[PDB]
Design a protein around this ligand. Structure first.
Ligand code: HTC
Length: 351
């Protein structure tokens, strides 16, 4: 890699890894549209396996960006509409609080207070229905944002219903395969297990546990090369052959709501570029202003998403206008501000 990229990356990441005590990390910088890879440490401390360009890391919430683009693709196909009532795709959702809650609200955490987590006891299809039927909103739809897996997770599950495919089948065939993400999985195949890094939480090796709507809200596992390719696709959607996929990417980067300096897309979150790095809590309810109608993907934006699981910590950020981006995958869930600080240090130096 160009010495400049080599230098800002190592000078920024090496101190981060030791300050946060990260067992292993992989980073990709997309510069002028080309990827440059870097890796450090261990994928498996006990087995002394290093982190490589083929190592799989749990993406946690960065998985929501795939869910948003898949939903976007379904909209482009004419299979669903964001303006459609949730009950249209789930008829047995007869409880009256749902009148008025659209797929848009579900996709953007604006349904009225759906919880961050789907309860651990919800572990069956009927359990899931019971849960949503009994949920009591705190607010009217389209008034406040409360980040939630029970919200975008449900959007993902309903978005693929017309297709008839399971969420994993639709993700593989409509998003992973067309984009050549051949080492990105919702469920890691035994063939790829030797590359699946262990997560580390308080010194213990851990992998994400199964849970309702896990696939849809935080279940993707991927490599630094496939994530670099995911960023390239999002940086230049118009370069994608598949028409509905190309449009689905643009729809996921459209600005539906605003809270402070941040704009909510489908999965992705955006801020106007240049951004104040300062501008880039277990539960934060924030009033949102509707963007009517939604602003189409803005090239001068810092588009990003943080993600975590018990044992992993991820971050992706890119700036379309500069053909610039970064992916940071670690097998330790460490503070988000540390992620964003290192990302900005690197991208600001290269812009
Ligand atoms: O077990 C855990 O501590 C744990 C933490 C996050 C997580 N991933 S998550 O549910 O998508 C999430 C909740 C709040 S933030 C995030 C995120 O990804 O940034 C998960 O599936 C398990």
């Amino acid at each position: 890699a160009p010495q400049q990229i080599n230098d800002i990356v190592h000078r920024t990441i090496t101190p981060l890894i030791e300050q946060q005590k990260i067992p292993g990390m992989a980073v990709a910088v997309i510069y002028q549209g080309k990827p440059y890879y870097f890796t450090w440490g261990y994928a498996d401390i006990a087995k002394k396996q290093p982190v490589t360009q083929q190592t799989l890391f749990e993406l946690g919430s960065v998985s929501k960006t795939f869910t948003g683009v898949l939903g976007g693709d379904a909209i482009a196909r004419g299979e669903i509409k964001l303006s459609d009532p949730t009950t249209k795709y789930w008829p047995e959702l007869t409880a009256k609080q749902w009148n008025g809650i659209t797929l848009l609200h579900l996709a953007t955490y604006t349904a009225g207070g759906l919880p961050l987590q789907v309860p651990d006891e919800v572990k069956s299809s009927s359990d899931l229905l019971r849960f949503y039927q009994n949920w009591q909103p705190a607010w009217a739809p389209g008034t406040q944002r409360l980040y939630a897996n029970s919200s975008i997770g449900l959007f993902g599950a309903l978005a693929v219903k017309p297709s008839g495919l399971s969420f994993e089948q639709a993700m593989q065939t409509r998003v992973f395969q067309p984009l050549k993400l051949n080492h990105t999985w919702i469920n890691v195949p035994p063939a790829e297990e030797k590359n699946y890094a262990w997560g580390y939480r308080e010194g213990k090796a851990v992998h994400v546990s199964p849970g309702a709507l896990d696939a849809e809200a935080y279940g993707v596992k991927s490599t630094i090369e496939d994530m670099a390719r995911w960023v390239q696709s999002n940086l230049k959607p118009l370069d994608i052959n598949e028409k509905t996929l190309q449009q689905g990417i643009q729809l996921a980067q459209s600005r539906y709501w605003q809270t402070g300096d941040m704009y909510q897309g489908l999965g992705w979150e955006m801020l106007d570029w240049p951004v104040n790095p300062d501008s880039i809590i277990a539960l934060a309810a924030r009033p949102v202003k509707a963007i009517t109608p939604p602003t189409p993907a803005v090239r001068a934006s810092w588009v990003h998403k943080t993600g975590a699981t018990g044992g992993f910590g991820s971050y992706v950020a890119f700036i379309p206008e500069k053909e610039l981006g970064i992916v940071m995958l670690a097998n330790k869930n460490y503070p988000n501000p540390a992620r964003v600080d290192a990302a900005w240090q690197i991208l600001n130096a290269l812009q």
